[PDB]
Amino acid sequence: DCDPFTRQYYQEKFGI
Amino acid sequence: PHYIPGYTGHCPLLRFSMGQTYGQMTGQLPPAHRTLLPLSSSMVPGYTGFVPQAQFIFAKNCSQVWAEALNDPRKFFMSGFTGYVPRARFLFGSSFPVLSNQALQEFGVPGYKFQFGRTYGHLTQDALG
Amino acid sequence: MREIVHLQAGQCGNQIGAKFWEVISDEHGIDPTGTYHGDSDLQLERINVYYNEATGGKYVPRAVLVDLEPGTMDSVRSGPFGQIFRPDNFVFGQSGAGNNWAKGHYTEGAELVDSVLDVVRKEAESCDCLQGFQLTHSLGGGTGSGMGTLLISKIREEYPDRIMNTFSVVPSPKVSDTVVEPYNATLSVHQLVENTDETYCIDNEALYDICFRTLKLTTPTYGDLNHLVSATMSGVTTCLRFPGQLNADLRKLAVNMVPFPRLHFFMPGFAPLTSRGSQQYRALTVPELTQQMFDAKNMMAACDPRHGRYLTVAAVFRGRMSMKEVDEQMLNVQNKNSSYFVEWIPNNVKTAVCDIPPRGLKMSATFIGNSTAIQELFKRISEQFTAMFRRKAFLHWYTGEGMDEMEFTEAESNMNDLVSEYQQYQ
Amino acid sequence: LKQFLEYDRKVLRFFCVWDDSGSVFGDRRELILHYFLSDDTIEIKEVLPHNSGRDAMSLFLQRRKLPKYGPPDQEFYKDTDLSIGTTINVWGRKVLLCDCDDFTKTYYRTKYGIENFTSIPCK
Amino acid sequence: MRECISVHVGQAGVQIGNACWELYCLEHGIQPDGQMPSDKTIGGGDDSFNTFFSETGAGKHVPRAVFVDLEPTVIDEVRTGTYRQLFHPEQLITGKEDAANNYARGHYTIGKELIDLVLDRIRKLADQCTGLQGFLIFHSFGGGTGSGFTSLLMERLSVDYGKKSKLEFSIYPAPQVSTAVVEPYNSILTTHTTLEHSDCAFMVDNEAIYDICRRNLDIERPTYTNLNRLIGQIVSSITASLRFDGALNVDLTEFQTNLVPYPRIHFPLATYAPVISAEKAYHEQLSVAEITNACFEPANQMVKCDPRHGKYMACCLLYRGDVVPKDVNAAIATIKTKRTIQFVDWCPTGFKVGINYQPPTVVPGGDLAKVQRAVCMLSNTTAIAEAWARLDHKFDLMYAKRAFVHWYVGEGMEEGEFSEAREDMAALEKDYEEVGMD
Ligand SMILES: Nc1nc2c(ncn2[C@@H]2O[C@H](COP(=O)(O)OP(=O)(O)OP(=O)(O)O)[C@@H](O)[C@H]2O)c(=O)[nH]1
Ligand SMILES: Nc1nc2c(ncn2[C@@H]2O[C@H](COP(=O)(O)OP(=O)(O)O)[C@@H](O)[C@H]2O)c(=O)[nH]1
Ligand SMILES: [Mg+2]
Missing domain, CATH: 1.10.287.600 (Helix hairpin bin)
Incomplete structure (x- = not known):
């Protein structure tokens, strides 16, 4: 799991 | 687009401001603003005749001067508050956080003679309803 | 939470404080029917300091209003902010003062001191935490020196360890209305020095000079004189009512400027004064306020301060301002006028700073000064x-x-x- | 000077009524207003009942030019600003005009000509 | 577990603390509402939030300090201020009246009507602390609730916790600029109830910080908020090891083993280093050399006292930031050449360095920029004597004409005390002149 910041960081850097 | 710290001179409304750096109190505060700063091939330069508007300008060659010429939660108050709350010394009902809370919202058997022979609880049912 | 009591005596004292009670009524935003209509919130946590609460939101002026002759009370209740005053606090006799100190102090006065001390200690005991006893009166009168001198004698023997300041009106040198002014003045001055341990007294002539030169009004009535002497006494208590970064409360404004126990005669003054037509042509800046605070013409001076030497000075300020300027500039006033500030005291001027400006301005100050020139x-x-x-x-x-x-x-x-x-x- | 001589002893006696029922504690108050036409100053007196709980003082508002709206473009009240059927804002207090002296009626007939004068008394 | 009780007492202290817990919270990612940032992270470890906070059961971490000022004005601005629903409802003891700037109202009358609860709370807090490392006091040195209440505690405290470090953060009177007129009195009277009850005196001025706000940070006309946050950061820089990881780590105990030499000589003047704005910042090379060949310069000392007409003795060089251990050695090596940073003959060593690894934090909306390093040269020099000589000389010049002594020995005291202070002070001076003596 991750916090509600790594999920945001991953959808505007690596396009998840 | 701020003023550099070494800059002396005049910037408007600097005298009434305080507590901020010279690049922030200037950047927070005219259309033509330039202070901050945000044919030639058909004639050879030896020519000595006349072309209009060609006796005026520098910053560029003669062969270029004929170019330019042509072109409600969180309402409570916590313990021991030595301020004044309206309706604090008057009313009551709960704790000082709730006292300061409620004070802010308010800022803005008959006929028993003729009962004979029927049960007393059943008598009060007739009196109540 | 820390409350003050203001006392009114004399015809002059009643008219000043009635003009003073309206200055804070529209400074704290209290409507002249008794309710409250303040703009901000910060003028509500300290509203008990100078007022107190009653049922229905109908806020009450905490003052006592006493005079022998009821003529001036008939004008106070008829004034703009006279429907707030409590008629329990309206204690009056039936005869006039006569402009003499005999029928104010010992014989006429002695049969009203019980009636007045009964209502003064009524509110003083109902007070949560008393601080001070302000009093406004005129020295050259029959009531201000008459009964305004019993109360300050009969409070101090009953509250011996509380600060109390007074607002006297000394008679002017070359213009007067009565011909009995030194009789009512000398007999007061001995008593005023003995127990007040603080005074505030500037004559009527200096109020005329400020309204002629600093403010430039052709026909100054008693209104703007009373407004101006009310402005210098609404800023003396501003640290008790508004927050700040370096403030001076009243007992704090007492030991800082009373060097000897009977050396307590001071000299008020209001900083942001200008003409009616020169508002927009004037930079309301704190280096320029204090040039105007430290003169004789725009500051409330019954006597010229250059004829003596400043012994100890206060400067309470109001409004959002920088502390570095006012620290360096009081240093500049000190060294430029080193011949007019005393030696043997290294720091001479108090620097008090508030957080919230008054109504109608963005910064203000009140000059409070002990001069040997007095x-x-x-x-x-x-x-x-x-x-x-x-x-x-x-x-x-x-x-x-x-x-x-x-x-x-x-x-x-x-x-x-x-x-x-x-x-x-x- | 020209207004002092023209309307020296011409006083406009305007009977009035004030109610404070929005407050928790209050009574229906009846007021008397005098308007000097010499210098346009409004003076308000108070008349009390036979056993009123209020102290019997003389005046309610002193001899001054009364401001237009609330407590203070310094616009003030004038004779044409108030009439019968309108409410005046006397220092944040809503006071309705009910009756007038007959001399003020004869004053109002000569200048504009208001007729039939439907007075609205309270009780 | 290395908790640290910081007692801020007074108008000043409360201010130099309402702007100290801000960064004491910012660094350890603490939300201005207890529950910490609960949606992201900031990297601090569920341990660094203990040096100055106390985890409850819902994250409502609470400040480990005590703010006491008689008048309620200031602490009321905290009760109703940006920082609330966090400061303990009782860690903010509210008094009644003020102090007038007369020591007495802090060491005789009202001064006593509150120490019963104030001392109580500081102990009530000691319970949770499983290692109170010291008592950092934050008050003025020229007021009433600053010298009074503090003095009372200072001694009172020692007679209950004793064995401990009493480092103090004070706003000493400035040479020329000054507010209250009886400052040279309420000050000479507190250097007699601290010189034998408090250890290191991290003393700070007002004119000096003001000149630095213009000569370096370029802020003509600064205020107290501008001054408090800088003094506030000196505090954080000192209490760095107790919370942040690093190489050489200096502790509150070590801050008084390589610092104060002889018992009484404990007057260190502090010196933050990367005091710079943002315009002249991302341009200059903040080098461990410059950030050091500046903390030893005269115009950068926060206590007006030429650091050249005297003799340094001990000098901690706390180094928060990306300071590799090497540069530090050479930096101090340069300092030892400069034939001007004169030294005495008793301290051949001299500098204690603490290269902690945690770059400074920027208080949202401030002059300080995002520098990646900082020094705090807290040093004991013998020129802090020219900071007393003045206050002292003044006392006499005024006491001569027994001025402002009535309302002093009146609320409770003893005229004699005045005289005794002057004596104790003459000694402090006599010893300083005999300490720097070869
Ligand atoms: N750096 C800084 N110094 C302050 C601040 N406020 C006051 N001071 C200093 O404190 C000195 C006066 O002492 P205070 O702490 O303000 O007064 P006090 O201890 O509360 O005593 P009283 O004023 O009688 O209540 C002044 O000379 C100021 O230099 C501040 O916000 N920041
Ligand atoms: N500045 C000022 N002085 C006033 C006012 N009313 C009265 N005085 C002064 O008071 C003096 C006489 O009043 P006084 O005899 O003291 O009133 P009494 O004490 O009630 O008899 C006059 O010389 C006036 O100068 C006022 O509103 N403002
Ligand atoms: Mg204080």
């Missing part, structure tokens, strides 16, 4: 006394009221003693 304010009354006592002009009225001549000279001997320590520090 000795000339008492020379002229003494010079007037010995020019009229030596003929025994009006000693028969005082003799007729059962009052002796033996301590009639004890008042002058002590104000001659009083000024002697003033002249010790030339």
Whole structure:
């Protein structure tokens, strides 16, 4: 799991 | 687009401001603003005749001067508050956080003679309803 | 949470404070029917300091209003903010003062002191935490020196350890309305020095000079004189009512400027003063306020301060301002006028700073100063006394009221003693 | 000077009524208003009942030019600003005009000509 | 577990603390509402939030300090201020009246009507602390609730916790600029109830910080908020090891083993280093050399006292940031050449360095920029004597004409005390002149 910041960081850097 | 710290001179409304750096109190505060700063091939330069508007300008060659010429939660108050709350010394009902809370919202058997022979609880049912 | 009490006596004292009670009523935003309509919130946590609460939101002025003759109370209740005053606090007799100190102090006064102390200690005991006893009166009158001197004598013997400041109106040198002014002044000055341990007294002439030169009004009535002397007394207590970063409360504004226990005669003043037509042409800047605070013309000066030397000075400020300027500039006032501030005291000026500006301005200040030049304010009354006592002009009225001549000279001997320590520090 | 001589002893006696029922504690108050036409100053007196709980003082508002809206473009009240059927804002207090002296009626007939004068008394 | 009780007492202290817990919270990612940032992260470890906070059961971490000022004005601005629903409802003891700037109202009258609860709370807090490392006091040195209440505690405290470090953060009177007129009195009277009850005196001025706000940070006309946050950061820089990881780590105990030499000589003047704006910042090379060949310069000392007409003795060089251990050695090596940073003959060593690894934090909306390093040269020099000589000389010049002594020995005291202070002070001076003596 991750916090509600790594999920945001991953959808505007690596396009998840 | 701020003023550099070494800059002396005049910037408007600097005298009434305080507590901020010279690049922030200037950047927070005219259309033509330039202070901050945000044919030639058909004639050879030896020519000595006349072309209009060609006796005026520098910053560029003669062969270029004929170019330019042509072109409600969180309402409570916590313990021991030595301020004044309206309706604090008057009313009551709960704790000082709730006292300061409620004070802010308010800022803005008959006929028993003729009962004979029927049960007393059943008598009060007739009196109540 | 820390409350103040204001006292009104005399015709002059009643009219000043009635103009003073409206200045804070629209400073704290209290409507002149009794309710409250303030803009911000910060003027509600300290509303008990100078007022107090009643049922229905109908806020109450905490003041006592006393005079022998009920003529001026008929005007206060008829005024703009006179429907807030509590008629329990309206204690009055039936006869006039007569502009003399005999029918104000010992005989007429003695049958009202019980009636007035009963309502003063009514509110003083219902107070959560008393702080001070402000009083506004006129020295050259029959009631201000008459009964405004009993109360300050009968409060101090009952509250011996509380600060209390007074707002006297000393008679002017060359313009006067009565011809009995030094009789009502010298006999007060001995008593005023003995127990007030703080005064605030500037004549009527200096109020005329400020309204003619600093403010430039052609026809100044008593209104703007009372407004201006009310402005210098709404900023003296501003640290008790508004927050700040470096503030001065009243007892804090007492030991900082009373160097000797009977050396307590001060000199008020209001900083942001300008003409009616020169508002937009003037930079309301704190280096320029204090050039105007430290003169004789735009500051409330009954006597010229350059004729003496400043012994200890206050400067309470109001409004959002920088502390570095006011620290460096009081340093600049000190060294430029080192010949007019005393030696043997390294720091001379208090720097008090508030957080919230007054109504109508963005910064303000109030000049409060002990000057040795105030000795000339008492020379002229003494010079007037010995020019009229030596003929025994009006000693028969005082003799007729059962009052002796033996301590009639004890008042002058002590104000001659009083000024002697003033002249010790030339 | 020209207004002092023209309307020296011409006083406009305007009977009035004030109610405070929005407050928790209050009574229906009846007021008397005098308007000097010499210098346009409004003076308000108070008349009390036979056993009123209020102290019997003389005046309610002193001899002054009364401001237009609330507590203070310094616009003030004038004679044409108020009439019968309108409410005046006397220092944040809503006071309705009910009756007038007959001399003021004769004053109003000569200048504009208001007729039939439907007075609205309270009880 | 290395908790640290910081007692801020007074108008000043409360201010130099309402702007100290801000960064004491910012660094350890603490939300201005207890529950910490609960949606992201900031990297601090569920341990660094203990040096100055106390985890409850819902994250409502609470400040480990005590703010006591008689008048309620200031602490009321905290009760109703940006920082609330966090400061303990009782860690903010509210008094009644003020102090007038007369020591007495802090060491005789009202001064006593509150120490019963104030001392109580500081102990009530000691319970949770399983290692109170010291008592950092934050008050003025020229007021009433600053010298009074503090003095009372200072001694009172020692007679209950004793064995401990009493480092103090004070706003000493400035040479020329000054507010209250009886400052040279309420000050000479507190250097007699601290010189034998408090250890290191991290003393700070007002004129000096003001000149630095213009000569370096370029803020003509600064205020107290501008001054408090800088003094506030000196505090954080000192209490760095107790919370942040690093190489050489200096502790509150070590801050008084390589610092104060002889018992009484404990007057260190502090010196933050990367005091710079943002315009002249991302341009200059903040080098461990410059950030050091500046903390030893005269115009950068926060206590007006030429650091050249005297003799340094001990000098901690706390180094928060990306300071590799090497540069530090050479930096101090340069300092030892400069034939001007004169030294005495008793301290051949001299500098204690703490290269902690945690770059400074920027208080949202401030002059300080995002520098990646900082020094705090807290040093004991013998020129802090020219900071007393003045206050002292003044006392006499004024006491001569027994000025402002009535309302002093009146609320409770003893005229004699005045005289005794002057004596104790003459000694402090006598010893300083005999300490720097070869
Ligand atoms: N750096 C800084 N110094 C301050 C601040 N406020 C006050 N001071 C200093 O404190 C000195 C006066 O002492 P205070 O702490 O303000 O007064 P006090 O201890 O509360 O005593 P009283 O004023 O009688 O209540 C002044 O000379 C100022 O230099 C501040 O916000 N920041
Ligand atoms: N500045 C000022 N002075 C006033 C006012 N009313 C009265 N005085 C002064 O008071 C003096 C006389 O009033 P006084 O005899 O003291 O009133 P009394 O004490 O009630 O008899 C006059 O010389 C006036 O100068 C006022 O509103 N403002
Ligand atoms: Mg204080």
